[PDB]
Design a binder for these strands. Structure first.
Ligand SMILES: [K+]
Ligand SMILES: [K+]
Ligand SMILES: [Mg+2]
Ligand SMILES: [Mg+2]
Ligand SMILES: [Mg+2]
Ligand code: NA
Lengths: 198, 129
RNA sequence: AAACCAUGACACCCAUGAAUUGGGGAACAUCAUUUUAUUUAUCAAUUUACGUGCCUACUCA
RNA sequence: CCUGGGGUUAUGUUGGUUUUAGAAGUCCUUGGGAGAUUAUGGGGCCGCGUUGUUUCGUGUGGCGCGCCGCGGCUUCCAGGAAUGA
RNA sequence: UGAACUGUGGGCCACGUAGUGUGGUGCCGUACCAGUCCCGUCCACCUCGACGUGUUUUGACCCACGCCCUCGUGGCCAGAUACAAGAAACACGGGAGCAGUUCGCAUGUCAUGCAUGGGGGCGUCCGUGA
């Protein structure tokens, strides 16, 4: 069927139900939508994952796609996620690019040759930007408590509070699921002067 | 120009505790600075501290509880054999009952009491008591 | 040379009130036309306020 | 990564002539799956006309998304992956 | 004598801790808010339908003790993903005291022939490193 062209070639023989359902929606969005009609026929996804918790009653749907289409997705986002959420009630849809990480070598000569996009620090901060994409990070803090615990807090602009606050508890869960690290969120009115909202 | 980030940071903390301040701002930060502060905090000498990100070398805000008498760096970083711990304790510490000398070893940055337990030498970084 | 601050150069921290020399911002002048919040507070979510003199019968907004 | 093409042994032993095949390189072609950066970038040959989710107190109230133009052909083209200032 | 950066992971129990938020459960007395009545116009009181404070569990930080993890994501359920020049890929009986470890009959008989009968580690060379 023509709708299978929206999946990676390896998954076309025996697709899963979630992958098949997403592929069907994308193909219908291809010929129906006006803005999405362009830039869609060059796109295909890798896999679809689903997560949930006893709290955060909504379900998280994570879609991974090849890194080449990151420029394509950036212009298309804020509309693809809106339409996908309409066709999947009860779920929150996230688009994340699949990236590779190079383990830190031990020799100084080998370390000097490592490509910096494949560094673990660079990869994790890019996955965070893939989440909450229409907003951007305006600040970041690390707190070291008296016990060995360490916390990382990420601040967002308070102007986007009405459009992103509902998804913050679920997006922290997805970030932990992908990177095995925890993040806390805050809002900053007047980020220039470092004023925290309350 | 500034030649040692660690020496600069330890001078700011010791100066603030002499004046009886509650908080101190340290700039710039580094990996060695954070590890040194984590050793002090584990033994209960400073308290909570926070790192601020600015896409350059960061900044640190430290809370002081008034228990720290003096801290300082040792320049240059002399080598210390595992049998030489008593010589350094006798020279730069108030007594043999309290206070720590901080070393950098192949197992990481640690105080001289832990290094003796693991039987490792290294290079002396500083002290606090 | 009393070639003197009789005080080597570079870098960090450092309490208070009046002044002063150059540059900039606010002001004057010229143009243009957050939720909240009945039952609150542990280190505040906005202390940003304010006028004068000279000035084409031009080294000048 | 794969399949279909082209153009030193071992013959009883030693010494000579001659080959069949490999392998290699070297040009075409089918199968498959990848890609850390979108085959849709340029012309011309030109012609035509110029109500569905989601918050918030069943419901209310907020919700965001949606509700020189077209056209077929052709040739050329790697020009976006780089810690930060 | 000389600035910063590539990075130190996560689950599952258990149980004495173990800080914090979020919600449960009852809640004498005190205090607060909202009602009712009442005095005063410059300074006062009564009686109720809730919020607090104080309990008691949950739950997330913390230390001690065990287990597990392809120990980010992805991909299988032997190959690829990473790592291994103490490695990979060829070969040597003059290579392992008989060619290592693991799933009486034959040859010879003019003989002291009195002889001989999957995968992984050994030794020795040759191509492969950025
Ligand atoms: K002189
Ligand atoms: K001057
Ligand atoms: Mg002199
Ligand atoms: Mg510069
Ligand atoms: Mg250095
Ligand atoms: Na003088």
């Amino acid at each position: 069927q023509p709708h299978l062209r929206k999946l990676r070639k390896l998954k076309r023989a025996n697709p899963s139900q979630e992958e098949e359902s997403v592929a069907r929606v994308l193909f219908e969005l291809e010929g129906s939508h006006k803005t999405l009609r362009a830039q869609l026929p060059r796109f295909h996804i890798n896999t679809v994952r689903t997560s949930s918790s006893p709290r955060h009653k909504k379900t998280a749907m994570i879609i991974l796609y090849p890194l080449r289409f990151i420029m394509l997705v950036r212009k298309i986002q804020r509309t693809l996620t809106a339409e996908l959420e309409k066709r999947f009630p009860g779920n929150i849809v996230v688009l994340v690019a699949q990236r590779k990480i190079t383990k830190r070598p031990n020799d100084v000569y080998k370390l000097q040759q490592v490509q910096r996009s494949r560094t673990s620090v660079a990869v994790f901060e890019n996955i965070l930007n893939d989440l909450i994409y229409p907003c951007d990070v305006v600040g970041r803090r690390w707190r070291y408590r008296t016990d060995g615990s360490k916390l990382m807090k990420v601040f967002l602009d308070a102007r986007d509070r009405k459009r992103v606050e509902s998804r913050l508890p679920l997006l922290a869960h997805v970030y932990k699921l992908l990177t095995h690290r925890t993040v806390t969120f805050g809002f900053m009115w007047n980020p220039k002067l470092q004023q925290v909202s309350s | 120009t500034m030649m040692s980030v660690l020496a600069n940071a330890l001078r700011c903390i010791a100066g603030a505790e002499r004046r009886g301040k509650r908080q101190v701002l340290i700039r710039p930060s580094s990996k060695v600075v954070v590890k040194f502060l984590q050793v002090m905090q584990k033994h209960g000498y400073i308290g909570e501290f926070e790192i601020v990100d600015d896409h350059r070398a960061g900044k640190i805000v430290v809370n002081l509880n008034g228990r720290l008498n003096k801290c300082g760096a040792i320049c240059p970083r002399f080598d210390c054999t595992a049998r030489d711990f008593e010589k350094w304790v006798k020279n730069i510490l108030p007594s043999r009952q309290f206070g720590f000398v901080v070393l950098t070893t192949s197992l990481g940055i640690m105080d001289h009491e832990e290094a003796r337990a693991r039987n490792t030498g290294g290079k002396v970084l500083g002290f606090f008591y």
